[PDB]
Amino acid sequence: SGAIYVGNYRVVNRHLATHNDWANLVWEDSSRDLLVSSTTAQGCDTIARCDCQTGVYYCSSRRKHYPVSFSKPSLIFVEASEYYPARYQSHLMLAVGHSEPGDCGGILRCQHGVVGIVSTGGNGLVGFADVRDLLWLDE
Ligand SMILES: NC(=O)[C@H]1CCCN(C(=O)Cc2cccc3nonc23)C1
Numbered sequence: 001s002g003a004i005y006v007g008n009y010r011v012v013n014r015h016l017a018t019h020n021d022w023a024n025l026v027w028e029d030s031s032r033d034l035l036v037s038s039t040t041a042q043g044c045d046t047i048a049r050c051d052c053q054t055g056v057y058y059c060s061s062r063r064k065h066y067p068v069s070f071s072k073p074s075l076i077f078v079e080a081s082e083y084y085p086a087r088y089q090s091h092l093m094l095a096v097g098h099s100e101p102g103d104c105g106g107i108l109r110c111q112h113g114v115v116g117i118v119s120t121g122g123n124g125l126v127g128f129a130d131v132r133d134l135l136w137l138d139e
């Protein structure tokens with residue numbers, strides 16, 4: 001579990017979105033596992049606007065933050081689940097690091113701000129859904 005709160009927005013993994021998220025839907029993309037809903041209270045998360053390939057992510061399954069090197073956002077194959085059929089997930093970044101289902105929603109950050117959230121993982125790898133291209137989250 002986990003979300004990004006920037007201004008009047010809440011960014012969550014689309015497969016973990018609530019009924020309230022869908023009733024206050026702004027934008028969603030199955031191919032990226034993202035859903036953005038509107039909020040009444042103000043959010044203060046700063047979104048990074050950069051091409052950083054190093055950062056720190058929160059791992060709930062370990063109650064620890066870990067430094068990582070991660071790849072550039074790309075289309076990566078992801079296996080089937082109770083949420084999606086087998087497909088290519090776009091805007092996805094992989095890092096060598098620990099993750100387990102339950103870790104989705106953990107924030108990845110660089111010195112510039114929020115880079116994205118945990119969305120996939122397995123076999124010593126962790127995948128992050130990038131949010132840096134969503135320029136409209138700030139305006
Ligand atoms: N974006 C998707 O299609 C997801 C949907 C939920 C299930 N997915 C996983 O990757 C499970 C998983 C296993 C093992 C470490 C994991 N860390 O985070 N998620 C992990 C795929």
Ligand SMILES: [Zn+2]
Nearest residue numbers: 050052110112
């Ligand atoms: Zn950065």
